[PDB]
């Protein structure tokens, strides 16, 4: 474990929603929560050992938080991941997740040039009580450290070090011990791992063997032991990444 490359840094983008409705149209409201999810989610991924040995210590810290108070502007038939109507149904509250993260990748791809990842937070209701989406660790490429994508539709090169998260599921605002999990979740997937199985009982716990870890696809709720932590699955996975990206984007701890 190298010192000087432990940390993978983040820009973080809170959009007009988020702004609006978890910030409460305040910037010191806006980042405070911010700086505190990834404080806790750093916990999680810092205290994990990686091997089961000595081989933690590996967190993530924010670069840069991103405010954008009000909707971008946008000329007719131009879309931007910041834009005051969903796409591609204007009639829903949120856009279709998968564009929605296309499109941020797109917006964002030079700052996502310079960074190991940038994670946007958003206040929408995604269709059937989808959370976020990220790249990496997809059963398709991405993650940690910025990897080209040249877009043909885009016709520009955008970055695959991306995710996102939404605070709000089912009309309402979410609990702070279920974002810390989408987060943790969908930064697991650019770490490189996938959802755990239900074939791989180590993976996938009953309940009474503390339940299910992270990364298993469907959502917690956050009152099981192993909920907030990583699966071997998610850590054999995530080992073979670190090695491999901790040289080329990680940083020292601030
Ligand atoms: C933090 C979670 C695990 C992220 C995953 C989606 C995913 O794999 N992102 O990387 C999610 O939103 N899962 C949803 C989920 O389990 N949502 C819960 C909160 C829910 O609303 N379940 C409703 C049951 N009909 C799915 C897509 C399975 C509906
Ligand atoms: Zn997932």
């Given at each position: 474990p190298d010192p000087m490359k432990n940390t993978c840094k983040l820009l973080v983008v809170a959009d007009h929603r988020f702004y609006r409705y978890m910030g409460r149209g305040e910037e010191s409201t806006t980042t405070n929560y911010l700086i505190e999810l990834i404080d806790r989610v750093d916990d999680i991924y810092r205290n994990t050992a990686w091997d089961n040995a000595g081989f933690k210590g590996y967190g993530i810290q924010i670069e840069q938080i991103r405010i954008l108070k009000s909707p971008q502007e946008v000329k007719p038939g131009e879309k931007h991941y910041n834009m005051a109507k969903s796409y591609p149904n204007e009639e829903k509250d949120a856009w279709d997740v998968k564009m929605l993260l296309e499109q941020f990748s797109f917006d964002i791809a030079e700052e996502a040039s310079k960074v190991c990842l940038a994670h946007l937070f958003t206040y929408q209701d995604f269709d059937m009580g989808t959370l976020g989406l990220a790249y990496g660790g997809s059963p398709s490429h991405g993650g940690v450290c910025p990897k080209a994508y040249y877009s043909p539709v885009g016709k520009k090169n955008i970055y695959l070090n991306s995710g996102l998260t939404s605070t709000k599921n089912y009309g309402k605002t979410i609990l702070t011990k279920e974002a810390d999990l989408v987060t943790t979740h969908e930064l697991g997937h650019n770490f490189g791992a996938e959802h755990d199985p239900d074939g791989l009982a180590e993976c996938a716990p009953n309940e009474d063997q503390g339940g299910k870890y992270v990364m298993y696809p469907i959502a917690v709720s956050?009152?099981?032991?192993?909920?907030?932590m990583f699966s071997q699955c998610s850590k054999q996975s995530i080992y073979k990444t670190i090695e491999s990206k901790a040289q080329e984007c990680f940083q020292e701890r601030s």
């Open positions: 956050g009152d099981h032991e192993n909920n907030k």
